[PDB]
Design a protein that fits this description.
43 residues, 7 chains, mainly alpha, part of a larger assembly, nucleotide-binding (chain B)
């Protein structure tokens, strides 16, 4: 099992942690912007 | 020798079977995980009942029977602990495999949504040269078939 | 008699994990993700043809 | 609706929920905008043949 | 000789890939063994305490 | 893995150029252009016969 | 986008990331600009033959 998993992963590299950091940061920015626009539109 | 486009539908059918196979296997896994949990609950219940008997035996100052019952309780306590250990281990693994199944089930239909377009484009491309062979456009006189051999004959 | 059911309680989990792992590379072969262009099958041979 | 009554927490969780569906919508729109031109071209080829 | 040598290299590449996979596997296995050993040591330390 | 496909991306061009070069002298042999009368084949042996 | 909000660090790392892809783009453009003339010449030869 470990061999097959490692081989499949070796054929196609998973995303680097930097990519994860970037996507997490930008989705945080997105949710903040959306909630801010919502709570501002109500007033 | 087989044609590459023919392997497409074959491999997709194979994968289609293998997906439901995986689903059935995961189902059976969930089943026994539930069964083991039930067994653990029954064991700890029996241990609690023996504890109640020990408590009752201590009443009336009959300490000896209380001692024997408390000694009896230990094996059931240990088995409860072991089963709790095993379950706390297995849970995360079934979570991970369920996630994997979700992702695969999505990707499969993702590919099935383009098999057809590829087949259509390939058949069009074949038909192109198919009738370009017969009765060449004679943009160049390099080669024409079935309308020149007949004409020359 | 105890140890036997002990092992039977994990045979299934092992089989499930192995089948999932196989299926992973099974459809990773067809239509590679092209994270790298090292090799892709059945969607490039068709495209190149 | 959850932001109304000043219950910001549920609004936050729902806005978080919305993101996956937004992403899937974007991906599908991408794929369709891609495929349209190809079916147009193949239809033209069929007419000519 | 061109196509012959290219086919040979094509085989040899996937061979190398498989070998590296097996290497990664046992490296993980050895790490797991180390963790188990240090866990047992910690348990004996608890008993001593 | 990168360098391999790098070379595979030119094997074909080399083969094509070589085949063209061979075909050049192949039909230059038969029915020489007679820019010089040094040697012509299969259209002079027939003519002389 | 990362430079916006004054987060210069992520901008620096992303700009560093961009360089490898820029270099690969340049190399491939080089190779194509090379190959074009050769296929033109061989096509002409084929016509004449």
């Amino acid at each position: 099992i470990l061999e097959l998993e490692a081989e499949r992963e070796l054929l196609n590299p998973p995303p680097s942690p930097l990519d994860k950091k970037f996507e997490q940061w930008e989705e945080q920015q997105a949710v903040e912007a959306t909630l801010a626009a919502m709570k501002a539109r109500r007033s | 020798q087989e044609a590459p486009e023919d392997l497409l539908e074959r491999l997709l059918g194979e994968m289609e079977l293998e997906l439901i196979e995986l689903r059935r296997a995961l189902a059976q896994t969930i089943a026994t995980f539930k069964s083991t949990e039930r067994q653990r609950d029954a064991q700890q219940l029996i241990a609690q009942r023996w504890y109640e008997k020990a408590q009752a035996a201590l009443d009336r100052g009959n300490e000896q029977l209380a001692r024997e019952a408390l000694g009896q309780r230990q094996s059931y306590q240990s088995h409860t602990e072991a089963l709790g250990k095993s379950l706390g281990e297995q849970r995360a693994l079934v979570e991970q495999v369920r996630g994997q199944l979700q992702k695969l089930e999505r990707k499969y239909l993702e590919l099935k949504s383009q098999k057809n377009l590829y087949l259509a484009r390939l058949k069009s491309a074949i038909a192109a040269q198919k009738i370009e062979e017969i009765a060449g456009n004679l943009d160049n006189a390099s080669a024409s078939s079935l309308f020149e051999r007949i004409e020359t004959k």
